[PDB]
Every structure is written in C-alpha cells, then in structure tokens.
C-alpha cells in the first residue's frame, strides 16, 4: 500500500537506507532499526520526496553529491523514482539529474558524483512497513 | 590432524537477510573447512529441504558450499540454514529470504469508486478513490467545468478545477477521499480521481447530482 | 505466434528436443538441426500433442516411461503443457500423469519413471521458429 | 616454462547457447591456464564490455575465469566472448545469450474481431479471430450453443482462426462466438451475423 511507510533495502550489501534524527544519512542491515521507516511521497508523476518518519526529515542531495536529511523541504528533496528493468528501484536527484541516492558495501552513503547506472549501489528494493 | 568444521570466509556471510524481487536467482554460501572434510546440508525453516520442495528444485555446489535457487517466488520466503559437520563438530548459519512481487504498470483504481451520488442541496458528500501502485502514485482530484455549453475547450481538453493534489502539503493519508462540505446546485457535476506513476496514468470519474 | 512451430530448449544442458524421422527421440544443442522444429497443437485447454514437423511424427510416452514419436496420434501423444512459476514449461503425460517429458544432461531422453518436479530435466523453454 | 593459454575444462564449454527466462542470473565460464598466467577480458558483441553497460553491472571472478550477470533482461541478449591471453598466445570462446520474457495470462483476442456482418441471403460469409497466447491456446467456434469448430489434431490451428459460413440463410443469422483458453484462463469475443 502506497500510503504506508516503506523500508528501502539496498541491493549493495543489504543495507536499509537510514535517516538519523540529527540529519545524518547512512545504511543499516538491522530491519528493526528505528530510523529506517521512510515515507515516500509523490510530488508529481515519477517524482518523490523521501521523508524519514522517525527523524521527521527529508532526504536531500547536495550540490557536491552528499546526502543529508533536511528539516523542511527544499528543491534538493526530490528524486526520480524509477522501477528499473531488473525490478529494483533507483532514486535519481531531480536537481542533480546524473546522480543517484546510493549506499557503499560498507554501509555509508555513496557520493552522487560517484554513482553510475551500472552500479549495484544505486539499486534499492522497497519493502512495506 | 583432526579439525572441527570452521568458516573459511566469514566475510562472505555478513549479509544475513536476502530481500529480492520475485524471479531472481538466489545463492546462499557457507564457505567452511575441516578434517575430515565436513558434510553440507540445508534446511528450509528448520526442516529437511529436499529439491522436490520447489518447482525446478535447486542446485547444491558442494565445492562452493552453496545452494542455489532459480526464479524465487513468495513460497520460497523463509529461513535457510546450512549445517556443515564432521566427527569433531558442526557449525550452522541461517539466511533470511524475502521475495517481493512488484508490478510495472500504471496505477489501478478500484472499480466502482468514486461512485455517482445524488444528494439534497446543502448535504455533505464525500467521494472515495482506492488506488494501487507499486511505484508511488500521484493522485489528484478534479471537477469538470462548463464555460458556456462546452465542457471541452479550444485545445479539445476538458476544462477542470484542481480540487486536491497529493504532495508534502497533502499527504497520501487524505488523498483517497474528496470531501464536499455543504453542497449547492453549483457543486453538481462530474468529479474525477486521477492517479499516475512514471509508467502511465489512470482515472475514474463519478457524477454528483444535487436536489 | 501459437500457429508457428516452436523449438523446445531444455533447461538441463541446453538441449533442444529432437524427433528423428525414424521415430527416435533425443536432444541436441544445435539450433540448426533439421528435426527440432515442433508443432504444438492443443487438443483442449492445457493439453497439447507435440508433432515433429520434419519427422511428421507425434511425441509419445510409453507405459514404462520411454519416449518415441508415433506415426499417427494415439492416446499417449497428449501432455499437460504448464507454464510453471519459474517461467519454464513442463510437459506432463496426460496418460501417465506423474511423469514428464525430460532430457538428461547427456542429451538423451529421461525415462518418465525417473522424472520429478524438482528436476532440471523436465523444464523447457519454448522458442519461436 | 613458457606456455600459451589453453582451456583447462573444455567439457564445461560445450553449451554455446544460453537461453533463459528474464530475471535469471547468468554466468559464463572460460576455464583456461598458461604461464605466465593469462589475462581474462570479456566482450559483448565484439566490443569492450564495461560493467556500467548494464544496471547492477556484473561480477568477474578471475579465480573462476567467469563472468556473472544478475537478473538478465532482453537488452542483455547478445554474444559474449572471453579473451584469455598471455605473451605466447590467446584463446577465445563465445556464448550466445537469449532472454525470454514469459506471458502467464489467459489468451488475448484482437479487439474488433470477429466483427458484425450484415449480408444477403445466400452469401458466403467468413469470420475471423486473432488469438495470442504464450502457452498453446485451445480455440473453438460457437453459435448461439452449437459447437461449429474446435482445435485439435483433426483441425489444426492453421484453420482455426477463420470461421467459414458457406451460402447463408435466414437460419444462419445470429451470434457467433470465438473462444480461446489455456490453463491460466479463458477468453472469447462474439459477433453478430445479420442476414437479409
């Protein structure tokens, strides 16, 4: 159900995207983590803002490609939610069009400036929560 | 030199949970070693796991200490435990498999909603729209308008009035029901529920008759 | 297109089901083989007869589970064509209900009496020809 | 002891063509050897094949002389060639990948067929029905019932898509239906024959 929060499981390591109440962004494999329940909201067709339910912050991509969770919505809080042909989702910055929300094999976000299409880090699988 | 089984690649076992979209090929590895060479057997949810337990079965490459399953479906969902053992000891490791069925198609609205409504002038009517979409759907409510006779304009598109639009200001929470407080002959007319994703667009309409 | 001949590629070895003009049945990897073009015809919902176009013979399962291609249609020339959940087709004898048309890793048909659901030998992939 | 690359397991290479249902993980192996130890590189359709060439990319286990692709899609269809090489020689082997997308749904009839027909008493009308089904469909023609035609060994698919009505009569007027079904489900379109 699209109305409920979703958990984003990254194909690269099995890390769930996490948004800390303090605005930090990273990953964690622990499904019971309190800060991994996200509320994906569509702003328009194919565009979503990712809100951390616990942290009450919005995932944002910065000009240099670093992630963080803003307190209020800005124009860096929108992404192109696309269900790829491999059946995994990808979240591309609507503002920095060539960069993806992605996590490294180590559990840390990967810089937009370093993400590409052939990368396992940019692939996520939505999981109802 | 008697040795109980031990993990040779614990680094390749850190990912305990395997979540994947249905139809994907799954492989679970339990690289271990010991002398004499231990035995490898698997268990689905703690029970003996024979290959006839699933269509197409599964392959167990012993040289790799792994089990492989093709085109995983929801019935495969569960816990799988490997048991490596020899005369001096045994070790085990469990993985959790979770398969998600997606749906790469435009949104789907429940048939029959919104439904036509006939009410008395001054009533409080509220429409419903039940949407279904794998990728987040963008819902919106519209009312069809007539500027003269035409309900359609120059461009051949219907004139409308955007009543509700999902987004940060109006969360999906309230997007499934359109509230019309105290109607009037004016409010009569066709109301439409639109829902779309990157794949496509859908919409159902209903008619409000006031008396 | 259902009307055209199809090639049956077995998941077990990549062997295409072959029907020799002399009635013998076996497998071959060579896609250009003259005797691999099959004409599947439905006798009723979910039931098909497999006709070797070149050999002009129908694939048949015998009481003991051996395969061969009959000259004319008999009651052993019908199978349950089922598109399994793994996206592979299986052909189960309508007469010997618990056995499947299958090929060994060696390229030879496998005895019905030896076929099971968890077997890679019973899985085939239809290929338009 | 200089040795040019050579296949160590030619037995594991006999399967040149790999056909599979989309979403499957594919792995191509080219077990070889030689001294000095050769290098292994892959080519999709004869061109350089970088991992960014497909979503999720691909893993190249050198210890296994293999390349692995997760959830293969139609765009992956093609020829892949491994190139094992060292100072004294090189060997290559190509595999053919074919990805099939299945259609697990009941038969689909072309919309608009059969179509209503109005004709003169004595004419020769013939209806059409265009069916689509992954698994073999069982087609049949009915008159509103009276079974007019049914697919099977006696009446091959060849003739099953067209219903022939030779020299009609006021009697032949009525609704004709085309049914098609597989193990998944059933479909049917109807048409009306009006005679004058």
UniProtKB/Swiss-Prot annotation, chains A, C:
<feature type="region of interest" description="Heparin-binding">
    <location>
        <begin position="104"/>
        <end position="120"/>
    </location>
</feature>
<protein>
    <recommendedName>
        <fullName>Fibroblast growth factor 2</fullName>
    </recommendedName>
</protein>
<comment type="function">
    <text>Acts as a ligand for FGFR1, FGFR2, FGFR3 and FGFR4. Also acts as an integrin ligand which is required for FGF2 signaling. Binds to integrin ITGAV:ITGB3. Plays an important role in the regulation of cell survival, cell division, cell differentiation and cell migration. Functions as a potent mitogen in vitro. Can induce angiogenesis. Mediates phosphorylation of ERK1/2 and thereby promotes retinal lens fiber differentiation.</text>
</comment>
<feature type="binding site">
    <location>
        <position position="12"/>
    </location>
    <ligand>
        <name>heparin</name>
    </ligand>
</feature>
<feature type="modified residue" description="Phosphotyrosine; by TEC">
    <location>
        <position position="58"/>
    </location>
</feature>
<feature type="site" description="Important for interaction with integrin">
    <location>
        <position position="110"/>
    </location>
</feature>
<comment type="similarity">
    <text>Belongs to the heparin-binding growth factors family.</text>
</comment>
<feature type="site" description="Important for interaction with integrin">
    <location>
        <position position="104"/>
    </location>
</feature>
<feature type="cross-link" description="Glycyl lysine isopeptide (Lys-Gly) (interchain with G-Cter in SUMO1)">
    <location>
        <position position="71"/>
    </location>
</feature>
<comment type="subunit">
    <text>Monomer. Homodimer. Interacts with FGFR1, FGFR2, FGFR3 and FGFR4. Affinity between fibroblast growth factors (FGFs) and their receptors is increased by heparan sulfate glycosaminoglycans that function as coreceptors. Interacts with CSPG4, FGFBP1 and TEC. Found in a complex with FGFBP1, FGF1 and FGF2. Interacts with FGFBP3. Interacts with integrin ITGAV:ITGB3; the interaction is required for FGF2 signaling. Interacts with SNORC (via the extracellular domain). Interacts with glypican GPC3.</text>
</comment>
<feature type="short sequence motif" description="Cell attachment site; atypical">
    <location>
        <begin position="64"/>
        <end position="66"/>
    </location>
</feature>
<feature type="site" description="Important for interaction with integrin">
    <location>
        <position position="105"/>
    </location>
</feature>
<feature type="short sequence motif" description="Cell attachment site; atypical">
    <location>
        <begin position="22"/>
        <end position="24"/>
    </location>
</feature>
UniProtKB/Swiss-Prot annotation, chain D:
<feature type="glycosylation site" description="N-linked (GlcNAc...) asparagine">
    <location>
        <position position="116"/>
    </location>
</feature>
<feature type="domain" description="Ig-like C2-type 3">
    <location>
        <begin position="107"/>
        <end position="194"/>
    </location>
</feature>
<comment type="subunit">
    <text>Monomer. Homodimer after ligand binding. Interacts predominantly with FGF1 and FGF2, but can also interact with FGF3, FGF4, FGF5, FGF6, FGF8, FGF10, FGF19, FGF21, FGF22 and FGF23 (in vitro). Ligand specificity is determined by tissue-specific expression of isoforms, and differences in the third Ig-like domain are crucial for ligand specificity. Affinity for fibroblast growth factors (FGFs) is increased by heparan sulfate glycosaminoglycans that function as coreceptors. Likewise, KLB increases the affinity for FGF19, FGF21 and FGF23.</text>
</comment>
<comment type="similarity">
    <text>Belongs to the protein kinase superfamily. Tyr protein kinase family. Fibroblast growth factor receptor subfamily.</text>
</comment>
<protein>
    <recommendedName>
        <fullName>Fibroblast growth factor receptor 1</fullName>
    </recommendedName>
</protein>
<feature type="domain" description="Ig-like C2-type 2">
    <location>
        <begin position="10"/>
        <end position="98"/>
    </location>
</feature>
<feature type="glycosylation site" description="N-linked (GlcNAc...) asparagine">
    <location>
        <position position="167"/>
    </location>
</feature>
<feature type="disulfide bond">
    <location>
        <begin position="30"/>
        <end position="82"/>
    </location>
</feature>
<comment type="function">
    <text>Tyrosine-protein kinase that acts as a cell-surface receptor for fibroblast growth factors and plays an essential role in the regulation of embryonic development, cell proliferation, differentiation and migration. Required for normal mesoderm patterning and correct axial organization during embryonic development, normal skeletogenesis and normal development of the gonadotropin-releasing hormone (GnRH) neuronal system. Phosphorylates PLCG1, FRS2, GAB1 and SHB. Ligand binding leads to the activation of several signaling cascades.</text>
</comment>
<feature type="glycosylation site" description="N-linked (GlcNAc...) asparagine">
    <location>
        <position position="154"/>
    </location>
</feature>
<feature type="glycosylation site" description="N-linked (GlcNAc...) asparagine">
    <location>
        <position position="79"/>
    </location>
</feature>
<feature type="disulfide bond">
    <location>
        <begin position="129"/>
        <end position="178"/>
    </location>
</feature>
<feature type="region of interest" description="Heparin-binding">
    <location>
        <begin position="12"/>
        <end position="29"/>
    </location>
</feature>
<feature type="glycosylation site" description="N-linked (GlcNAc...) asparagine">
    <location>
        <position position="92"/>
    </location>
</feature>
């Amino acid at each position: 159900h699209f109305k409920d929060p979703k958990r984003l499981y990254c194909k690269n390591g099995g890390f769930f995207l996490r948004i800390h109440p303090d605005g930090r962004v990273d990953g964690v494999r622990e499904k019971s983590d309190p800060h991994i329940k996200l509320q994906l909201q569509a702003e328009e067709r194919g565009v979503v803002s990712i809100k951390g339910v616990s942290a009450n912050r919005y995932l944002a991509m910065k000009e240099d490609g670093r992630l963080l969770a803003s307190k209020s919505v800005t124009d860096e809080c929108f992404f192109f939610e696309r269900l790829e042909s491999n059946n995994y989702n990808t979240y591309r910055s609507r503002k920095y069009t060539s960069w993806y929300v992605a996590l490294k094999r180590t559990g840390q976000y990967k810089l937009g400036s370093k993400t590409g299409p052939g990368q396992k880090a940019i692939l996520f699988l939505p999981m109802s929560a | 030199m008697p040795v109980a089984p031990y993990w040779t690649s614990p680094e390749k076992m850190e990912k305990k949970l395997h979540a994947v979209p249905a139809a994907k090929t799954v492989k679970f590895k339990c690289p271990s070693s010991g002398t004499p060479q231990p035995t490898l057997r698997w268990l689905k949810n703690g029970k003996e796991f024979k290959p006839d337990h699933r269509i197409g079965g599964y392959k167990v490459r012993y040289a790799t200490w792994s089990i492989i399953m093709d085109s995983v479906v929801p019935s495969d969902k569960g816990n799988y435990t490997c048991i490596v053992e020899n005369e001096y000891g045994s070790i085990n490791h469990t993985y959790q498999l979770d398969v998600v069925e997606r749906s790469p198609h435009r949104p789907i609205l429940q048939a029959g909603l919104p439904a036509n409504k006939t009410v008395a002038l001054g009533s409080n009517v509220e429409f419903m729209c039940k949407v279904y979409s794998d990728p987040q759907p963008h819902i919106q409510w519209l009312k069809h308008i007539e500027v003269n006779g035409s309900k359609i304009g120059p461009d051949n598109l219907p004139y409308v009035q955007i009543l509700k639009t999902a987004g940060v200001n109006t969360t999906d929470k309230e997007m499934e029901v359109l509230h019309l407080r105290n109607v009037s002959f004016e409010d009569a007319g066709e109301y439409t529920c639109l829902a779309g994703n990157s794949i496509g667009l859908s919409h159902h309409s209903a008619w409000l008759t006031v008396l």
